[PDB]
Every structure is written in structure tokens, then in C-alpha cells.
Amino acid sequence: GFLAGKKILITGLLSNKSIAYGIAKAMHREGAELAFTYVGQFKDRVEKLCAEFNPAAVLPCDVISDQEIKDLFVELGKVWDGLDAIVHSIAFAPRDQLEGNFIDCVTREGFSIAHDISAYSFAALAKEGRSMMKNRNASMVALTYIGAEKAMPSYNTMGVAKASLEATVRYTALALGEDGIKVNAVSAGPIKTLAASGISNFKKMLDYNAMVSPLKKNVDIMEVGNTVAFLCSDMATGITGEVVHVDAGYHCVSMGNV
Amino acid sequence: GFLAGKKILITGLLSNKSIAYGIAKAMHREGAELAFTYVGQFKDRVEKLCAEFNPAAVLPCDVISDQEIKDLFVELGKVWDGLDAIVHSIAFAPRDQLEGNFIDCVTREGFSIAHDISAYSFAALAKEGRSMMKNRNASMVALTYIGAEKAMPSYNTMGVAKASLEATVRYTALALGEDGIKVNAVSAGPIKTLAASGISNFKKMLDYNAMVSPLKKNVDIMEVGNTVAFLCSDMATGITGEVVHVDAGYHCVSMGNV
Numbered sequence: 001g002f003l004a005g006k007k008i009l010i011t012g013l014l015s016n017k018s019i020a021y022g023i024a025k026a027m028h029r030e031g032a033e034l035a036f037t038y039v040g041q042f043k044d045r046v047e048k049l050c051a052e053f054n055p056a057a058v059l060p061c062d063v064i065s066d067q068e069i070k071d072l073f074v075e076l077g078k079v080w081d082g083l084d085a086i087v088h089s090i091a092f093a094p095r096d097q098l099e100g101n102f103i104d105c106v107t108r109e110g111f112s113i114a115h116d117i118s119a120y121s122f123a124a125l126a127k128e129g130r131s132m133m134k135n136r137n138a139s140m141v142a143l144t145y146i147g148a149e150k151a152m153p154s155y156n157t158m159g160v161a162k163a164s165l166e167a168t169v170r171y172t173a174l175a176l177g178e179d180g181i182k183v184n185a186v187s188a189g190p191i192k193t194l195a196a197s198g199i200s201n202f203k204k205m206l207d208y209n210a211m212v213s214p215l216k217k218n219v220d221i222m223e224v225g226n227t228v229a230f231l232c233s234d235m236a237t238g239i240t241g242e243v244v245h246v247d248a249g250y251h252c253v254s255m256g257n258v
Numbered sequence: 259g260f261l262a263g264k265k266i267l268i269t270g271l272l273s274n275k276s277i278a279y280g281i282a283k284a285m286h287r288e289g290a291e292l293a294f295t296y297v298g299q300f301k302d303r304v305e306k307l308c309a310e311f312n313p314a315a316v317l318p319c320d321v322i323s324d325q326e327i328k329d330l331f332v333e334l335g336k337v338w339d340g341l342d343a344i345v346h347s348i349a350f351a352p353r354d355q356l357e358g359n360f361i362d363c364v365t366r367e368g369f370s371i372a373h374d375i376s377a378y379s380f381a382a383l384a385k386e387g388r389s390m391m392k393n394r395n396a397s398m399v400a401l402t403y404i405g406a407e408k409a410m411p412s413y414n415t416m417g418v419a420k421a422s423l424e425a426t427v428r429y430t431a432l433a434l435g436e437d438g439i440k441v442n443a444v445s446a447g448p449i450k451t452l453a454a455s456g457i458s459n460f461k462k463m464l465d466y467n468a469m470v471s472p473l474k475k476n477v478d479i480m481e482v483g484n485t486v487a488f489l490c491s492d493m494a495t496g497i498t499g500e501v502v503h504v505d506a507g508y509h510c511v512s513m514g515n516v
């Protein structure tokens with residue numbers, strides 16, 4: 001596999017349907033040694049889910065806490081000498097932030113919380129993981145949505161946070177490039193997941209994409225997963241600060257619905 | 259290999275140093291059956307160069323002629339049933355178009371000729387190759403430069419043509435998506451090639467990139483090659499109408515201060 005022997009940490013595995021699950025499948029297939037994080041009381045769920053992937057570790061990390069992030073790389077640094085990649089696949093905003101009108105529903109705290117978890121957490125992982133990733137063609141890949149680029153209904157504060165994430169990807173790439181670390185993001189098309197079912201009429205947003213995009217379809221977690229895998233390989237060492245759209249071509253059209 | 263049994267046409271192989279050479283190396287390693295094009299009197303050069311790649315065909319194609327493009331898919335259609343990918347790696351503008359001041363040097367014919375060969379030729383290959391590429395998760399990949407996005411010294415009409423190419427990539431993706439064909443471009447960082455030595459102080463433009471970009475380096479033809487390969491694989495079926503920068507992260511920075 002093109003990830004043979006590489007040591008990669010995966011965040012945000014929560015379900016059979018999670019994008020992280022797809023990323024894991026791809027990376028396992030390609031021969032990576034994987035470690036997974038989990039939040040609070042999902043310990044048992046995640047341990048069972050990712051068992052099939054032979055993880056070198058399944059450790060607690062709520063990216064709300066600087067302490068846990070620091071402890072993550074302590075515990076991880078015990079079982080691994082160095083680390084080849086980090087996969088950021090974490091997003092949250094309080095539910096009141098995703099209902100209807102952006103200016104109506106937006107709040108100072110919901111804005112803060114969404115950025116803290118969905119954007120800042122990335123540079124945090126980069127901050128603490130940096131020394132384990134020095135000079136070994138290491139890699140970081142964040143997950144983002146086109147809601148960062150264009151104003152959309154319902155996405156609201158999450159869209160603003162995603163924009164924050166993407167700039168952070170860029171500034172993390174400038175910061176970590178001197179250590180040979182590459183930093184990139186995959187902008188996924190909508191996928192039916194646990195985070196996804198946190199918004200109202202998803203089945204049709206998902207059908208709109210299918211109708212209006214060039215390949216007339218939705219992307220699966222393997223399409224996204226396989227792309228993340230590539231971006232953590234020696235093949236992608238010319239690529240950093242980049243956003244690769246995996247959305248069946250949605251990003252490149254306008255009015256494609258005649 | 260992730261391109262096992264796939265039938266891919268490669269244009270613009272001219273040298274040991276060509277981007278196409280790197281693309282070939284990558285695709286061969288991944289188990290693709292390859293065919294190559296050549297212009298006029300380079301027959302012997304290209305035949306010898308690409309011998310190592312076991313080509314199913316080495317055929318003449320000057321993209322200036324609609325007839326030759328049509329004949330290419332006739333001859334190719336003889337030795338292959340269908341075709342999985344086309345790799346566009348062709349660019350030209352008259353030398354008078356690349357000296358100094360854009361408005362000084364630009365001409366109606368140089369503008370026409372550059373677009374004809376560097377941009378139109380892509381939609382031409384798509385036009386004629388379309389039937390051989392129907393409903394088999396087929397792929398097109400064009401090579402482009404950041405001169406398309408931003409105004410640069412010397413690049414001039416070639417920059418304008420590259421912008422034309424990138425839009426053509428987008429419109430070809432909308433056109434061919436219904437047939438399951440994906441269309442994408444790789445925006446390569448500067449690389450010391452035969453086309454490249456057609457501009458004056460390349461050694462330093464190449465050194466500026468190395469200094470100012472996040473990974474503090476230049477990309478090699480394998481980094482580009484390996485990315486083109488990926489974009490022609492079943493792993494990239496969620497990706498179309500996209501421009502992936504392979505430029506050591508140059509695209510994402512401003513003011514690498516000196």
C-alpha cells in the first residue's frame with residue numbers, strides 16, 4: 001500500500017457512516033498503522049468500531065481542552081516514536097446556530113464555540129503534534145465544506161467557522177513547511193452522516209447536489225477517504241495549503257440546473 | 259497498481275525532463291497501458307524515450323490539425339476497445355509573446371495561436387475521445403500554471419491561454435460528467451524542462467519558488483506525475499472540474515518576505 005508503515009492519527013470517528021470511517025478503511029487498505037481519538041462517553045462505541053483497523057491506540061481527546069490535546073501526544077508518543085499524519089475530521093456548533101436566518105440565530109458564544117472546535121482545534125493538534133512530525137514527510141489533512149466559500153442556507157456559523165478552518169490550514173502550512181510537513185484540506189460534498197442529520201432537509205440538499213453537479217451524483221466516504229489517504233502519501237509531497245474538492249464537481253458549476 | 263489495466267493516452271512527451279515523462283513513470287509503475295503522441299519530426303526521439311513504458315501505440319498528433327486529432331482516435335480505436343484517460347500536457351505561444359511587457363508584446367495572432375494550442379486542443383481531444391471514454395469511469399487531466407490566476411512577468415499571453423485552458427477544463431467537466439468522465443487540471447510549480455528553458459531567468463524564478471513557498475523547495479516531475487496518476491484512478495471519482503496545485507505550496511502564500 002502507498003501508506004505502508006506510516007503512523008497516522010484519526011480524529012472524529014463516531015459511526016459506521018462517519019467520513020473518518022471511510023478515511024480509516026482507505027488508510028488500512030494502504031498499510032498504515034492507525035490511532036483513533038474519541039470524546040467522553042463514546043469510548044466503547046469507537047473501540048468496537050475501529051477494532052477491525054488494528055489500532056495502535058484508542059485515546060480520549062475532547063479538543064475543547066488544551067490539556068487533553070497535550071496528553072494525547074504524550075500517550076501516543078509512548079507507543080510511537082514519530083508520527084506521519086494527523087487527520088482532522090471534527091466540527092461542532094450549538095444547534096441554535098443552524099436554524100434559518102444567519103443574523104437572527106448567530107450569537108457571540110455560538111460563534112466562539114464553533115471556531116474553537118471546528119477551526120482552532122486544528123492548529124492545536126498541529127501545535128502539539130509538531131515535534132513527533134518533524135522531518136519525515138509528515139502530513140495534516142482537515143475536512144471542510146463549500147459553506148466556507150459561499151453563503152448558504154442553514155450552514156450559518158458553521159460556514160464562517162469552516163472559512164476560519166481553511167485559513168488555519170493555510171497558515172499551518174506556512175508554519176510547518178520548514179519541518180517538511182504538508183497541510184491540506186478536503187472539501188467534501190454532502191454525505192449522510194451523524195453530523196449531517198443535525199440539519200433539517202438534508203435528503204434534498206443531498207439530492208440537489210446529485211442533480212446539479214457534473215457527475216450527477218453524491219460522493220461516498222470512500223471517495224473522500226481515498227483522497228485523504230493520497231494527501232498523506234509520499235506521492236503528494238508537492239501539495240500543501242490546498243483545498244481539494246471531493247463533491248462530484250459541484251464547486252465548479254453555477255445554474256447547472258437549467 | 260491503482261491504474262491496473264487502464265488505457266491512458268499521454269501527450270506532450272518530448273524529453274527525459276518533460277512533465278509527461280514523470281506522468282508516464284508514475285502510470286507505468288501503477289500498471290497502466292500507455293499510448294503516446296508526438297509532433298512532426300520528433301518521431302524517433304519519442305519512440306526511443308517511451309520504449310521503456312511498453313506503449314500500445316506511438317502515434318502522430320499535431321493539435322493544430324483537427325484532422326490529425328480525429329485520425330489519432332481512429333488509429334488508437336483500432337488497438338484499444340475503449341480508453342480510460344487522456345493526459346493533456348501541451349502548451350505553446352510564439353516566442354515574441356513572452357518577452358517583457360504584455361501590452362507591448364501581445365499580438366492578435368500570438369494570442370490566437372496560444373489559445374488554439376494551449377487551451378482549445380483540450381476540448382478537441384475531449385470531443386474526439388468522448389466515445390471511447392463513455393461509461394467506464396474515464397478521466398481527463400490538463401497541465402496548467404498559476405500564471406492563469408495571477409498576472410506575472412514574462413508569462414504574458416501564455417498566462418491568458420492558461421486561464422482559457424482552466425475554464426475549458428471546467429466546461430469540459432460539465433459536458434462530459436453525464437458519461438462518467440472526470441476532468442481536472444494539475445497546476446504545477448515551475449520545473450526545469452524544454453518548454454521552461456523558453457523563458458529567460460528561469461534558474462531564479464525556480465529559486466524564488468524554492469525560497470518563498472512553505473515547503474521551501476521545487477517540485478519534481480514525479481510529484482506532478484504521481485498526482486496526475488491519482489486523478490486518473492478510481493480513487494478520484496468524486497473529483498472533477500478541479501485544479502490541484504503541485505507547487506510546494508506556493509499558491510497559498512503572499513509576502514514570503516525578501
Ligand SMILES: NC(=O)c1ccc[n+]([C@@H]2O[C@H](COP(=O)([O-])OP(=O)(O)OC[C@H]3O[C@@H](n4cnc5c(N)ncnc54)[C@H](O)[C@@H]3O)[C@@H](O)[C@H]2O)c1
Binds near residue numbers: 011064117192193
Ligand atoms: N456530512 C457532510 O455533509 C460533510 C461535508 C463536508 C465536510 N464535513 C466535515 O467532515 C468532518 C467529519 O464529519 P462527519 O460528517 O463524518 O460527521 P460525524 O458526526 O460522523 O463526525 C463529526 C466528528 O466531530 C467530532 N467532534 C465533535 N465535537 C468534538 C469535540 N469537541 N472534540 C473532539 N471531537 C469532536 C465527533 O466525535 C465526530 O466524530 C467534519 O469536520 C465535517 O464538517 C462533513
Ligand SMILES: NC(=O)c1ccc[n+]([C@@H]2O[C@H](COP(=O)([O-])OP(=O)(O)OC[C@H]3O[C@@H](n4cnc5c(N)ncnc54)[C@H](O)[C@@H]3O)[C@@H](O)[C@H]2O)c1
Binds near residue numbers: 322401450
Ligand atoms: N515547466 C513548468 O514550469 C510548468 C509549470 C506548470 C505547467 N506546465 C505545463 O505542462 C505541460 C507540459 O510542459 P513541460 O513543462 O513538460 O515541457 P515540454 O516542453 O516537455 O512539454 C511541452 C509539450 O508541448 C508539445 N507541443 C508543442 N506544440 C505542440 C503541438 N502543436 N501539438 C502537440 N504537442 C505540442 C511538445 O511536444 C512538448 O512535449 C504544458 O501544458 C505546460 O504549460 C509546465
Ligand SMILES: COc1ccc(Cn2cnc3cc4c(cc32)CCC4)cc1C
Binds near residue numbers: 145153190
Ligand atoms: C448548506 O447545507 C449543508 C450542507 C452540508 C451540511 C453537512 N455538514 C458539513 N459539515 C458539517 C458540520 C456540522 C454539521 C453539519 C455539517 C452540524 C454541526 C456540525 C450541512 C448543511 C447545512
Ligand SMILES: COc1ccc(Cn2cnc3cc4c(cc32)CCC4)cc1C
Binds near residue numbers: 413463
Ligand atoms: C513564472 O514564470 C514562468 C514559470 C514557468 C514557466 C514554464 N512554462 C509553463 N508553461 C509553459 C508553456 C510554454 C513555455 C513555458 C512554460 C514556453 C513555450 C510555451 C514559464 C514562466 C515564464
